[PDB]
Amino acid sequence: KIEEGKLVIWINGDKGYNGLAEVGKKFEKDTGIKVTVEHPDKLEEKFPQVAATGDGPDIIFWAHDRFGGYAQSGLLAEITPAAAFQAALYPFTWDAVRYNGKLIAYPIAVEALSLIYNKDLLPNPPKTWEEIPALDKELKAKGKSALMFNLQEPYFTWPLIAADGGYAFKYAAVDNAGAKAGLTFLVDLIKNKHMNADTDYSIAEAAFNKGETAMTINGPWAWSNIDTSAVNYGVTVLPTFKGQPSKPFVGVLSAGINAASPNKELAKEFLENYLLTDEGLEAVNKDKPLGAVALKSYEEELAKDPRIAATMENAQKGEIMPNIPQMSAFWYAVRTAVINAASGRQTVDAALAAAQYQTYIAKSQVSRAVSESGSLKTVIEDCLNNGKTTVGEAAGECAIGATGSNILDGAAQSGETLAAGTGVPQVTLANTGAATIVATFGNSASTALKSTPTTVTWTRTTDGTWTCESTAAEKYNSSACPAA
């Protein structure tokens, strides 16, 4: 249970958590409020499960696109910043932390794709997609290709697909016309052999960092690898398409306040008047760079770095990453259509009209149940090898310490507190050392997993070996837990 009087913070391990902790040691100096910054593994998965019972951190830092799901579950507190504070952040960043017209988190950092180019190969990088074919032919006559970037993930081609507004098509005849024009141009690049349909993230990054291609498309997370390489690189605005800017998806690292937290007034003070200052954001940016930031005053000091300036410019011309869970199936279909077109599996027309989202969800939920139940194996080994063969909360019994999961049905066996609509895997032990861990799908599991009785079961043999068996369809299973 969250302890009143103190702030606990969760932030990913690739962020400046030591720098944030320095912001926080200052907070305890001007209060009596200790602060602790933790960077737990898989914190974005743990948070909804801990917060459901009133546990977890007071503040969580993560990309805004996850916070729509937390907000839908009522796990984030609505924040009410005064106008004086809101005017200190770029207006579009507040849009990323809105859910049902309510502010749900504080924007911190802003990321988007940019055009990265090798200054030695290409001192005059193109301002338009249209001129890339001719430049590719010229560079190849000089021993290099024009452009390599990840074509397997539509996130990377989206800036071109979303560029054309399609307003001109209306006058020649918003819907899908602009996306058709962008996709058709992408498909033509590939058929004319200016790009390969099989180019993925690893191939493109290796090519650019080895100096084999003049341009790539990537975000700030990729810069340090190019820094290590020999490449004299620059970062600039994405090229235009049909005279209109590329529109990349925008990710906004945001700080939400746990709705079960009893220190909401304490967290509001720390985030607004300490972290989101020029001083607070520098203490984190000194540790590990945030890229572009939502704070106007600090972002103006970072824009001297052309890489950071280009990131914010592309972000301001793009669109905020979708965060509405009710729209997830729509966007999964959009992703599927883009891959089918780019890969040449379908025409542009047929792709935008034709891999089930249910399969992705069912596989993910099965894998989650396998991992959730499997995480109890080491606990059970500790019990069995210390002679404890009864599950329970009393002394001398095996206390499972399970965490409730909203895709499972199963009451706690060792005194754990579960929220409604959650369950834990069910543990049985025997004096022989045999054991089972049975996770039964229920509550908010997919109908794909609830339409018949369906389980994932870890079985311990008396030699101490474990195996996993699923009664879900093999279509939704993995090698870790096959069907019988």
Ligand X SMILES: N[C@@H](CCCC[NH3+])C(=O)O
Ligand Y SMILES: N[C@@H](CCC(=O)O)C(=O)O
Residues forming the site for ligand Y (CB under 6 A)? 332, 335, 360
Closer to ligand X by CB, 369 or 391: give it: 391
Q: Taking the complex as a whole, how short is the minimal distance between the CB of residue 397 and ligand X, in angstroms? A: 7
Please list every residue from 281 through 310 that binds ligand X, using CB under 6 A: none
Dump the DSSP string for 265-277: HHHHHHIIIIISS
Interface positions, 361-420, toward ligand X (CB under 6 A): 389-391
Q: What does the alpha-carbon distance between residue 238 and residue 257 come to, in Å, rounded to a whole number?
A: 35
Residues followed by a break in the chain, C–N over 2.5 Å? 173, 354
Nearest CB to ligand Y, comparing residues 23 and 341: 341
Residue 258 sits at φ, ψ, to 5 deg, of -55, 130
Give min distance, CB of 383 to ligand Y, in A.
35
- Specify the residue, 198 or 227, whose C-beta has the smaller distance to Na ion: 198
Strands (E) located in 184-324: 213-218, 233-236, 249-257, 292-293, 319-320
Q: Which is nearer to Na ion, 196 or 343 (CB)?
A: 196
460 binds, among ligand X, Na ion, ligand Y, none (CB under 5 to 8 A by kind): none
Choice from 102, 140, 170, 191 touching Na ion (CB under 5 A): 140
- Which secondary-structure segment (H or E) carries 440? strand 435-440
Of 429, 437, 449, 456, which one interacts with ligand X (CB under 6 A)? Answer: 429
428 binds, among Na ion, ligand Y, ligand X, none (CB under 5 to 8 A by kind): ligand X
Question: What is the gyration radius of the CA atoms in the chain, in angstroms?
Answer: 25
Question: Which of Na ion, ligand X, ligand Y, none does 389 bind, CB closer than 5 to 8 A by kind?
Answer: ligand X
For tokens 């948070």, name the residue. Answer: 47
Count CB-CB contacts under 10 A for residue 260: 20
The site partner of 145 among Na ion, ligand Y, ligand X, none (C-beta below 5 to 8 Å per kind) is: Na ion
**Shortest Å distance, C-beta 133 to Na ion:** 14
| C-beta closer to ligand X: residue 65 or 409 | 409
Q: 6 with 279: CB under 8 angstroms? A: no
Q: Which of these segments, 14-22, 282-290, 354-362, 422-430, binds ligand X (CB under 6 A)?
A: 422-430
11 and 27 in contact (C-beta within 8 Å)? no
- Cβ at position 412, least distance to ligand X in Å: 12
Look up residue 239 and give its two tokens: 């090229």
Query: Which residue number, 293 or 352, has a Cβ lying nearer to ligand Y?
Result: 352
DSSP readout, 324-373?
Answer: -GGGHHHHHHHHHHHHHHHTTSS-HHHHTT---HHHHHHHHHHHHHHHHH
428: contact with ligand X by CB under 6 A: yes
C-alpha 170 chain-centroid distance = 36
Instruction: Tell me which stretch binds ligand X (CB under 6 A): 22-30, 182-190, 238-246, 423-431.
Output: 423-431
**Residues lying near ligand X in the complex (CB under 6 A):** 389-391, 428-431
